[PDB]
Amino acid sequence: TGGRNSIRYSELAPLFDTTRVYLVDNKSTDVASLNYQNDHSNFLTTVIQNNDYSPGEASTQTINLDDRSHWGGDLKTILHTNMPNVNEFMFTNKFKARVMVSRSLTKDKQVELKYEWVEFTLPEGNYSETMTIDLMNNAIVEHYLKVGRQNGVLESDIGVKFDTRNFRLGFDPVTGLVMPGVYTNEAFHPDIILLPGCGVDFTHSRLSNLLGIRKRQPFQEGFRITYDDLEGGNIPALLDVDAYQASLLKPVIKPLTEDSKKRSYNLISNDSTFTQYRSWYLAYNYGDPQTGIRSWTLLCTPDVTCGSEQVYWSLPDMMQDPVTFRSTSQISNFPVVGAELLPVHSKSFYNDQAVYSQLIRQFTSLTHVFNRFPENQILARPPAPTITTVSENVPALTDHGTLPLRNSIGGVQRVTITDARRRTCPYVYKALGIVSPRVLSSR
Amino acid sequence: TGGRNSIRYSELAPLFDTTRVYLVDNKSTDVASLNYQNDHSNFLTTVIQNNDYSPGEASTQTINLDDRSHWGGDLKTILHTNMPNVNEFMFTNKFKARVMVSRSLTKDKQVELKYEWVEFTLPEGNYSETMTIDLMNNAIVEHYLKVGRQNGVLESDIGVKFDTRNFRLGFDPVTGLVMPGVYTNEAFHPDIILLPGCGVDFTHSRLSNLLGIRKRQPFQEGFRITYDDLEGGNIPALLDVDAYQASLLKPVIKPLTEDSKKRSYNLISNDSTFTQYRSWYLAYNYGDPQTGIRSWTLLCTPDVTCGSEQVYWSLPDMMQDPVTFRSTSQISNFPVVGAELLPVHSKSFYNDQAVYSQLIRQFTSLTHVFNRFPENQILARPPAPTITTVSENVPALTDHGTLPLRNSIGGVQRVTITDARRRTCPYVYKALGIVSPRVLSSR
Amino acid sequence: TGGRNSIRYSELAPLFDTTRVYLVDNKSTDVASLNYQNDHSNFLTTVIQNNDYSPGEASTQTINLDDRSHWGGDLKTILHTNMPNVNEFMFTNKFKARVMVSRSLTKDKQVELKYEWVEFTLPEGNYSETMTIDLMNNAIVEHYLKVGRQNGVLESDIGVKFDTRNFRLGFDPVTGLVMPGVYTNEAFHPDIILLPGCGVDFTHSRLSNLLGIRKRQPFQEGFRITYDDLEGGNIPALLDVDAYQASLLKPVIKPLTEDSKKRSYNLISNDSTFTQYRSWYLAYNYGDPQTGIRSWTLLCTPDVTCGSEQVYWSLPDMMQDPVTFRSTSQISNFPVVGAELLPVHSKSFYNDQAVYSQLIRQFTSLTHVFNRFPENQILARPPAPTITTVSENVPALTDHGTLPLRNSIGGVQRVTITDARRRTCPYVYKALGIVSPRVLSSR
Amino acid sequence: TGGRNSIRYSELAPLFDTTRVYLVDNKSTDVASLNYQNDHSNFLTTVIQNNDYSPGEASTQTINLDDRSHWGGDLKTILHTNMPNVNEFMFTNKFKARVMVSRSLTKDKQVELKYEWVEFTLPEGNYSETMTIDLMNNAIVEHYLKVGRQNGVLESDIGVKFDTRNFRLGFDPVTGLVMPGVYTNEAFHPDIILLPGCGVDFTHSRLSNLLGIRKRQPFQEGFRITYDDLEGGNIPALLDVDAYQASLLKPVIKPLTEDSKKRSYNLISNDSTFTQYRSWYLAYNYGDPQTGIRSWTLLCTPDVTCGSEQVYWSLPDMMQDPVTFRSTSQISNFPVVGAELLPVHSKSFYNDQAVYSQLIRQFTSLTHVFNRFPENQILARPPAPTITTVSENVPALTDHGTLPLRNSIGGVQRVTITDARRRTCPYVYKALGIVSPRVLSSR
């Protein structure tokens, strides 16, 4: 320690024992000269914070930690993002699903309905755990409006629909039917996937996390759930309110075959006490726990963030690249000095006006856009949850610890916030660096 | 320190004094090759973060900390879960209770009513301190609808019911009765257990914690509370509003024998100023503090989490297994390097619309599903609390400290987040590891 | 350091330099064998985490830190409680006060009214800063209903009442009276104590903290406040609304002698512009700041916790008992290794529906139980505050630092969370311990 | 280190290397004997935590750190206060301002109105950022009711009034007037000061911070703002709604000279499109940025705390009094060992029922006490902000670091939490101390 601990600049002053180097994006001089066509998750800083020098010719000068003992440096970072929820880079703007396109051209008198897989798109910015559902449901429907009805497909033949409510709620075991003729419009958190003949696919989406459905073995590439897979679910049929309560020697056993503005419920047969609409939530809970989707998958809470993936710092013109890491110039394989978690968490709130979520649309815009089928008790406006989560960005200010330090530091350091696939994150508005060099050995 | 502190990789570079090794689940290469049928609470990582190598043949290479001094490593971990409240692994989906099945087949003119213990089931996902009550109460009732009424059992003979309100509130000491003829519908936190002739059992449930009832000596395996145990409680009888207020030399002494839609209150006798419905809350508070259930148990606040049990890290192809720990290959007895708390806490909110919790059901769905008996002032819809708690998952980012380190580290480390019974937790979506090796001795 | 740093187990392995010992309550084996009749704030743990041993015969084995250098151990603890607000152990369930019992038997034509001190009781569980007031007020009244009215005492003779509002608000200095004939029903935080002829006493209560009234010199045992002490307060009289507004040469000077359902305001005389009802808040603020209760006491914010008292860890079969501490076997004098704060804080919220706190009772239950006197503007339902605080339990996870360590550690450590009077806290559901032994000297 | 590190008590035991000393207020024995007439921000503790000793004769005994090496001690403290917002010690209960007393006795027919400075007083407890305004405004008015009207002063001659809203909002540049005849009743945060002929003075108040108005050079003793200083503000005149909208060639140019219940707006002349009422907010924003109050002062956010001043620990019978500090016995100059921030922060909330803040008073009490002039659009009830802040007390638990330690420690330490003027803070209900002595040198 007491030997050579010198930290010499240019023709300035020896300051022996530990000092500060600063990795700053905001440097008024350099912003123009370098970083012109660079962001905040990939940039160059002048670490010669000397006023009297050309930020070009600053590169010439060396920091020079003493080359008699091995230096280390304590690294602190201040990172901040403005990343939303649903996004391009995050694969949270897109999801795939199967819908019907053709409704039975009736070739030689017989019903031949076709199906197809399509990639729905979302409009980035938005971020509610509730309304992110409604948005997908809108773009299942904005598809029907573009192709479905135009080639014959009925409104009662919708297909993929993300609801949130417990369907087998209200069900009576002897009736085979839901007793108060309306599915209990109270949200039950992991939003179901409802399907007849078709299905979804989050095989390249993180939105499956927003829904709170996850593969029980999730390193297995390929997450697709279909109508064949949802077996055991099968949302029970309603019950004609009026064909018992306004009648009545008992006519109990009457399912609500159609609805208000004449929308068929596609009941299996006239005998059946079930509809052909199938529910993930009921299959995960009320289906066979060993044969079907409870073995396949897992009931998790909705993650409004969709991954909470880590970012990694690379400081590779300063720090001694750690063990095993290639010393490279590929911006995609830069040695990692430290790894933060990407600074976004879920902040949950309460709101009982989820009951008057209905009294949202009525004075909102009277549009019913997230509500094309208010009369139908399936394809309906999904209820809202009691607790809404919003992906909130927050300042992360974390100590990466003490890293080994090279003893000749260019006045032009490169700072890089890579992601979990070592690509730049373009939502990093503010990255920062404080390094504190200090002794460790001899030679 | 200044002697041999070498950290040598393969045919790469000696980096002497402290560096970083990374335990990452997200590694793009290995996710396919290994971990295919593994989760995040049990996995293998390539700790050779070298690009140019076969993730199979990476296993060959050694990290090699110098074998001249004993190394240690500072361990930091970033753990995140998506675990809900009520759950399968957590034993929060099931509870046992006693209900009546048979109502008096009347063998040779005499009332012979039978009882049985049964295991009610919950639908995992959901998580409110209020609605988690309502859900159990629903599945006490969904049972009656399956067996009870069908073999004779009356609606006035319900049995196990979890309400939340102070019953002896409103009570007048000379009347022997509740004066304004309605039990004061304001929630008083630990939700009672109400019973005649029957009882509950949380002997294999953590839901007893949700209720905020706990054994005063809780290591004693076996938590069951019954009607015999609740002695002293005995919710006082109401008071016929109209047989005093519309009456009139005073007819005060009239209990409300039945209710609105003719539901008997099972009063002990016509003499008695009490009902046969018994309350835990009244027994814990107003019963004999030494004879009954105040000595047996404890009034705690509701824990929406139901345990806050710890998890444990095991890093056993890296860390020197601590004192006493067997060096094993049983995935269930892997040496523990560190112990976090399982990352879920209670976030409480306020809502005065618990008063208009009634005005929840009326515009919710008009279903009254959590309210089959709105007229009856016992078996009624329980009130909601003023402060509702929700089990919120949160990122845990904690320093486990500096652990001893083996000096030859395979490029294939195994990371394992075991639980309080050393079994894998399948709610761990993101586990992470940063290790910082540093010197400690010589030989 | 480099000499003898050996940490030897049984016939296992020397792991030289620092390792982990774990103090766990959850250990599956020992929960049965030991701790059977023990809680979480007093227990025994097997610190031999070896699978292959009898948890009885584990006691035999020694941890054995090297007896050549003095060891220390870094101690981390994870503590969690389920303690409510109002409680038995916390002395927050009970308070004393003086009420009248006898209203003038009129021995030889003359009004002789008697008084007595009594101990009111609360029903543990509950915890609001507002409703905790209402509950005491209820049990001032539940007393009147048991003895007061029965031996003659009028409703207009209530006595001890905890309101929250500024009384001298609305007062006009020339009228001697409150101008809009209603005391301004907006809460002003430290809830007053209102009294004629009687008083309160929190001499063995922490509830005086909930009220936000504190002795200015609070180590002086004995906190009782009486009508004689509250001098200068004297809530001003109202004003007969109708005997000015429906009148009119001005009749201004008419106090509201009685109220709606004929309840006297006990005005000093017909001359007096004051009532005999006295207010702590007015005395603390508007009385003589040197002669009365502003010198006696202090206006603090309500503490919904009632003390935030510290707990203490005692690890006495492991840690070297610190300086001065007796080496004992009295579970009440066990040496302290560390002291946390008992893990409960106040979480405050906002609610403007404190205005419609009136519209709470009307759709709550229409009971008016915390409101027996809605017409009377003194004994009335107190208003609610704008900011309500609730005693929330939270996980405490704190570093107690590095303590001296005995070098022969029994496989049967005793962990004890004592309180500020060294007695066990029976609200501790989860206690935990992580110890990291490391070197300090030689001999 | 390895030499003499002995820590010897009495006739007890040598515990060599680091241990714990505890500074506790709660000690059952001493609370009676000493501290009887002392608080928690100034007390004596027995640091001999030995049971078997007279707390008097404990003073005799010495802790005795070894006098061969210089000791230090790591100091941790747990501090908690119950300090409100508006207060006596904090100078947040008082403020000075100028009002008129005399309205023109008209000596020889001519209007001679007098003015005077007075010290308004607040009732300590209360603490809202909104209602703390309303309270001052009340005590501007409670003054008028005591002296103003009685010596002639009109209600339209009020003077000092603290509103919150943007006045020049609604203003049309060609009309010279506010177009919808009502000043836009939406709060705009730093509450103005409104004045004609008079002014305020926070020269000994921290309430100027609550208002969010601050001297741009604030070390300059003396903060007084007057009508002469507010030049350029001059809230524009309204507009007679009916003398344009109900009249059909345009009568636009009619100011609302009086109001509803005949209250003059004191317009400069009949010509003028401004009123004589002047606004700080408009002067700070719309006046000359160089000539007037924008140069004088600064627009800051409201601090509900009013200062966030620091407290200081003094441990002067233990710690070696730091550099420069006099070794004294004046309780007002005790050496400082550490400095915390006084544990109170602002917790902000949202409430849109600030719009129905009007529908607060109507069902509150119908008192209009903070609203004597509801018809008048200046002297009116100020609007509420969307975000209300409340001064919340919180437990502070902070590491003051490692301080030098005297090697002979009396069993009677004195703990003192001084303020920013080295006087005791009598809001400190719980102070605590953990010290960990450890070696530093030799002699």
mmCIF file of C-alpha atoms in Angstrom, chain D residues 266-348:
data_model
loop_
_atom_site.group_PDB
_atom_site.id
_atom_site.type_symbol
_atom_site.label_atom_id
_atom_site.label_comp_id
_atom_site.label_asym_id
_atom_site.label_seq_id
_atom_site.Cartn_x
_atom_site.Cartn_y
_atom_site.Cartn_z
ATOM 1 C CA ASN D 266 -62.416 48.153 -5.358
ATOM 2 C CA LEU D 267 -61.682 48.725 -9.074
ATOM 3 C CA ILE D 268 -59.001 51.417 -9.579
ATOM 4 C CA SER D 269 -61.501 53.678 -11.390
ATOM 5 C CA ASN D 270 -64.659 53.082 -13.495
ATOM 6 C CA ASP D 271 -62.249 53.328 -16.519
ATOM 7 C CA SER D 272 -59.889 50.599 -15.215
ATOM 8 C CA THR D 273 -60.033 47.012 -16.391
ATOM 9 C CA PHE D 274 -58.118 45.953 -13.235
ATOM 10 C CA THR D 275 -58.992 45.693 -9.530
ATOM 11 C CA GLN D 276 -56.873 47.063 -6.666
ATOM 12 C CA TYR D 277 -56.430 43.483 -5.410
ATOM 13 C CA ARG D 278 -52.797 42.459 -6.153
ATOM 14 C CA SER D 279 -51.425 38.910 -6.675
ATOM 15 C CA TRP D 280 -47.975 37.509 -5.918
ATOM 16 C CA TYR D 281 -48.437 34.705 -8.452
ATOM 17 C CA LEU D 282 -49.213 37.124 -11.255
ATOM 18 C CA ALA D 283 -46.343 39.382 -10.230
ATOM 19 C CA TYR D 284 -43.912 36.460 -10.129
ATOM 20 C CA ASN D 285 -45.163 35.331 -13.519
ATOM 21 C CA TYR D 286 -46.767 38.111 -15.545
ATOM 22 C CA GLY D 287 -45.141 41.246 -14.054
ATOM 23 C CA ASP D 288 -41.767 42.642 -15.129
ATOM 24 C CA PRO D 289 -39.267 39.766 -14.588
ATOM 25 C CA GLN D 290 -36.485 42.240 -13.785
ATOM 26 C CA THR D 291 -38.202 45.150 -11.978
ATOM 27 C CA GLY D 292 -40.432 43.327 -9.524
ATOM 28 C CA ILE D 293 -40.980 40.326 -7.323
ATOM 29 C CA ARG D 294 -39.550 37.648 -9.768
ATOM 30 C CA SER D 295 -36.079 39.100 -8.988
ATOM 31 C CA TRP D 296 -36.905 39.476 -5.291
ATOM 32 C CA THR D 297 -38.103 35.937 -4.749
ATOM 33 C CA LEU D 298 -38.531 32.365 -6.074
ATOM 34 C CA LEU D 299 -41.298 30.036 -7.062
ATOM 35 C CA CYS D 300 -40.759 26.801 -5.208
ATOM 36 C CA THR D 301 -43.052 23.866 -4.468
ATOM 37 C CA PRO D 302 -44.896 23.960 -1.126
ATOM 38 C CA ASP D 303 -42.930 22.321 1.662
ATOM 39 C CA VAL D 304 -45.439 20.893 4.054
ATOM 40 C CA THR D 305 -42.548 20.362 6.555
ATOM 41 C CA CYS D 306 -41.440 23.978 6.439
ATOM 42 C CA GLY D 307 -37.690 23.439 6.710
ATOM 43 C CA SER D 308 -36.486 19.870 7.116
ATOM 44 C CA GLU D 309 -33.924 21.038 9.647
ATOM 45 C CA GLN D 310 -31.249 18.744 11.004
ATOM 46 C CA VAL D 311 -30.858 17.451 14.508
ATOM 47 C CA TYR D 312 -27.594 16.631 16.222
ATOM 48 C CA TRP D 313 -26.523 13.845 18.613
ATOM 49 C CA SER D 314 -24.184 14.640 21.495
ATOM 50 C CA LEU D 315 -22.825 11.730 23.484
ATOM 51 C CA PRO D 316 -20.331 13.608 25.460
ATOM 52 C CA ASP D 317 -19.626 11.284 28.446
ATOM 53 C CA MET D 318 -18.569 8.563 25.912
ATOM 54 C CA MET D 319 -17.330 9.871 22.574
ATOM 55 C CA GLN D 320 -14.169 11.858 22.193
ATOM 56 C CA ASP D 321 -15.484 15.284 21.308
ATOM 57 C CA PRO D 322 -14.431 15.949 17.643
ATOM 58 C CA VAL D 323 -12.015 18.597 16.394
ATOM 59 C CA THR D 324 -12.622 22.126 17.534
ATOM 60 C CA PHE D 325 -15.502 21.254 19.898
ATOM 61 C CA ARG D 326 -15.256 22.729 23.388
ATOM 62 C CA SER D 327 -15.473 20.215 26.215
ATOM 63 C CA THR D 328 -18.352 21.775 28.136
ATOM 64 C CA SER D 329 -21.165 21.269 30.612
ATOM 65 C CA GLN D 330 -23.546 23.721 28.999
ATOM 66 C CA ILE D 331 -26.441 21.546 27.710
ATOM 67 C CA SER D 332 -26.588 24.002 24.793
ATOM 68 C CA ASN D 333 -22.982 23.542 23.531
ATOM 69 C CA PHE D 334 -22.422 19.801 23.899
ATOM 70 C CA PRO D 335 -20.033 18.425 21.276
ATOM 71 C CA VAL D 336 -21.672 16.792 18.252
ATOM 72 C CA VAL D 337 -20.982 13.221 17.386
ATOM 73 C CA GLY D 338 -23.475 12.976 14.546
ATOM 74 C CA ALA D 339 -26.203 14.755 12.673
ATOM 75 C CA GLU D 340 -29.429 13.270 11.335
ATOM 76 C CA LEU D 341 -32.196 14.945 9.470
ATOM 77 C CA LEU D 342 -35.232 15.559 11.774
ATOM 78 C CA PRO D 343 -37.449 12.643 10.842
ATOM 79 C CA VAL D 344 -40.396 14.163 8.979
ATOM 80 C CA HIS D 345 -41.079 14.086 5.225
ATOM 81 C CA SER D 346 -43.867 15.090 2.863
ATOM 82 C CA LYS D 347 -46.213 12.296 1.750
ATOM 83 C CA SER D 348 -48.265 13.493 -1.192
#
